[PDB]
Amino acid sequence: GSMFGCLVAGRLVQTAAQQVAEDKFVFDLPDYESINHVVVFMLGTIPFPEGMGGSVYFSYPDMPVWQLLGFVTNGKPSAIFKISGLSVAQIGISVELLDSMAQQTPVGNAAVSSVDSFTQFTQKMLDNFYNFASSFAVSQAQMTPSPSEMFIPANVVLKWYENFQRRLAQNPLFWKT
Amino acid sequence: SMFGCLVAGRLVQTAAQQVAEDKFVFDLPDYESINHVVVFMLGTIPFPEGMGGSVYFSYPGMPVWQLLGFVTNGKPSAIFKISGLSVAQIGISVELLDSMAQQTPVGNAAVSSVDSFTQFTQKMLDNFYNFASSFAVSQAQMTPSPSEMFIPANVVLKWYENFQRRLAQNPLFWK
């Protein structure tokens, strides 16, 4: 039956999926270049049969190409997936065996966490630093022997970042007021 | 029922509590585990012409409401970041679109607060530079390590001055 919902921010919820098989459902995403995230969820009307779950796929025609985004289950009946990166795209939902889904690997870049904003900035801050500062990095063997010339060890970046991750994992709001 | 409400990872709720002829409420248990909430129109009942929906969030402390954003006929769905400010509430108030136009949502789909995230970026920048600066060493004081790379301290300072200057002009210039 009709057990799935598909949502793109700014548009109306889709609840009528084309059934391309007994265990497969497909939504169309028109003008998908505009879309960063998709919300896929169970309608709450029909649960997954025993031992079953949902494998969520995305497809952009080039012909099609199905990339595994993640999963939807009875205990986790909704998810937000990032579509950015990878006119009419498709969202596919395959009803699979749970033990089969357990051996599948969804593409990284698809998962959305409560920490993405903080992680994205910090990584881009350090990348920005690297691209700028590494052009000036030198080994000791390469230095013009100036006794008072000040330097900063490059490996402080990794030590700061590793510390940042530990602090972020323990509390995403360690920095707040 | 006119609206749908979804905490990402949980089951969608579609049975809003009408508390007034123009206001609707969803109850959300355990808000400490709530990160993303999706509020949308079911597509059964549209707003009357000239009206829209202002979405508010309340968290206990004692209940304080906050403007998350809007859902309208023009934009029938919206995603809101919640983590960052055990039962919370999503409130949907039917308002004039002209009234909603002068309201300022604290939130965003990516961050709970535009101003709190600005504070985050500024603190991370300062914390990183402060940490890195601490290890400043003159060539006279360096202990021989052939496989270590060193950055000129003035280059590090220049990057820091550049980054905060650029972060000021456009807080999202990095992305």
CB within 8 Å: A125 and B35: no
- What is the spatial distance between Cα A151 and Cα B175, in angstroms, rounded to a whole number? 29
Question: Cβ–Cβ of A125/B78 closer than 8 Å?
Answer: no
Select from B76, B135, B147 the Cβ nearest to the Cβ of A156. B135
Of residues B109, B111, B136, nearest to A150 (C-beta):
B136
Provide the residue type at B86 as one letter. S
Angle at B49 between CA B48 and CA B55, to 5 degrees: 60
DSSP classification of residue B44: S
Distance, in Å, from the CA atom of A86 to the CA atom of A68, rounded to the nearest integer, reads 10
Residue of chain B minimizing CA distance to A127: B174
Residue of A114, A142, A164 to mutate when probing chain B, most B C-beta within 10 A: A114
What's the gap between Cα A116 and its chain centre? 9
- Strand ranges for chain B from DSSP E: 3-7, 17-20, 23-29, 36-41, 51-59, 64-71, 77-81, 87-96, 137-138, 149-152
> Which residue shows structure tokens 């939130």?
B107
* Intra-chain end-to-end CA distance of chain B, in Å: 39
Pairing of strands B77-81, B36-41: antiparallel
Contacts of B152 in chain A (CB under 8 A): 136, 138, 149-152
Chain A residue with minimal CA distance to B161? A129
Mutate to test the interface with A, among B68, B71, B79 (most CBs of A within 10 A): B79
Q: Is A105 on the interface with B (CB under 8 A)?
A: no
On whether any CB of chain B is under 8 Å from the CB of A112, the answer is yes
Question: Is the CB of residue B170 less than 8 Å away from at least one CB of chain A?
Answer: no
Longest Cα–Cα distance in chain A: 77
Residue A44 φ/ψ region, left for φ over 0, alpha for ψ in the -120 to 50 degree band, beta for the rest = left
> Which of B6, B146, B162 faces A78 most closely, judged by CB atoms?
B6
Q: Facing residues of A57 across strands?
A: A68, A92
B25 and B19 Cβ atoms separated by less than 8 Å: yes
- Decide the pairing of beta strands A78-82 and A52-59: unpaired
**Any CB–CB contact under 8 A between B39 and chain A?**
no
Q: Does A63 touch chain B (CB under 8 A)?
A: no
| B11 with A80: Cβ contact below 8 A | no
Which residue from B117, B120, B119, B130 is spatially nearest to B160, judged by alpha carbons? B130
Contact A14, A93 (CB under 8 A): no
Give yes or no for a contact between B56 and B69, defined as CB atoms under 8 angstroms apart: no
CB atoms within 10 A of CB A81: 20
**Cβ-Cβ contacts under 8 Å, B35 against chain A:** 113-114
Q: How was this structure determined?
A: X-ray
Structure tokens of A73?
Answer: 């289950």
Distance, in Å, from the CA atom of A110 to the CA atom of A83, rounded to the nearest integer, reads 7
Facing residue for A9 by CB, picked from B109, B133, B154:
B109
Burial of B79 (0-12, 13-18, 19+ CB in 10 A): buried
Nearest to A10 among B4, B77, B84 (CB): B77
**AA identity, residue A168:** L
> What distance in Å separates the CA atoms of residue A62 and residue A172, rounded to the nearest whole number?
39
